[PDB]
Design a protein around this ligand. Structure first.
Ligand SMILES: [Hg+2]
Ligand SMILES: [Hg+2]
Ligand SMILES: [Zn+2]
Ligand SMILES: [Zn+2]
Length: 236
């Protein structure tokens, strides 16, 4: 399907909830209107001054379950916190970010629902439960928050750090553009009849960064707000 122009744009958790609570048609994801912040991100061998903004949110597959007629059960399933399993498996270089980057979420009216030390850390699995009743086949998904980054000057040394990236020259400096993803403490359960094939990390990066963002003009479906550098409230 691709064609990410089909997805709407939402600002903050109330708007994302509005999108997900509209059961009139199956939902896969949305572009996110969020603020840009500036601060350190460790990539490869050092910290780089990085611009970060939220850009997309999507539902990533957890599991499918079929329950017979007259059966009520407490279903246990694994959700994750911190960076997504797909993001973690896709990165080639040493990668880490301090907890204070979360000002990007606060300023964008998004909350991860996880602790300060958990939200931007390594992938950590946890058990979640829902009492469910049959008959039916149901698919469980977890909300993924996607961010675009410009790690300034990182492009000469880290051009192969990520599965998908773009470098851009600024005078004699080389910037590194890439996406990252973390989870939110939010999961959706839908009958197999109200379900479509969910988006995955490879598809999201190809469409959002490679096809829909142009570092050359800082345009496409989103733009970074460079004024973050000059705003103390958006520096972490
Ligand atoms: Hg969404
Ligand atoms: Hg997001
Ligand atoms: Zn905005
Ligand atoms: Zn401000």
């Amino acid at each position: 399907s691709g064609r990410f122009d089909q997805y709407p744009t939402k600002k903050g958790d109330f708007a994302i909830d509005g999108y997900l609570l509209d059961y009139s048609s199956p939902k896969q994801g949305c572009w996110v209107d969020g603020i840009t912040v500036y601060g350190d991100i460790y990539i490869g061998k050092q910290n780089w001054g990085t611009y970060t903004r939220p850009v997309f949110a999507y539902l990533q597959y957890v599991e499918t379950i079929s329950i017979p007629q007259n059966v009520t059960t407490t279903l246990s399933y694994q959700l994750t916190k911190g960076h997504t399993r797909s993001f973690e498996t896709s990165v080639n270089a040493k990668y880490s970010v301090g907890a204070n980057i979360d000002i990007v979420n606060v300023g964008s009216e998004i909350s991860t629902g996880f602790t300060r030390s958990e939200s931007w850390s390594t992938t950590q699995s946890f058990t979640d439960t829902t009492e469910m009743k049959g008959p039916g086949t149901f698919v469980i998904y977890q909300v993924v928050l996607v961010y675009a980054h410009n790690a300034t000057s990182a492009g000469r040394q880290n051009a192969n750090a990520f599965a998908y990236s773009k470098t851009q020259a600024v005078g004699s400096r080389v910037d590194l553009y890439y996406l990252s993803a973390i989870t939110q403490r939010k999961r959706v359960i839908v009958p197999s009849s109200n379900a479509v094939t969910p988006l995955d990390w490879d598809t999201v990066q190809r469409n959002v960064l490679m096809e829909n963002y142009n570092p050359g003009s800082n345009s496409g479906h989103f733009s970074f707000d460079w004024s973050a550098y000059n705003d103390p409230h958006r520096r972490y």
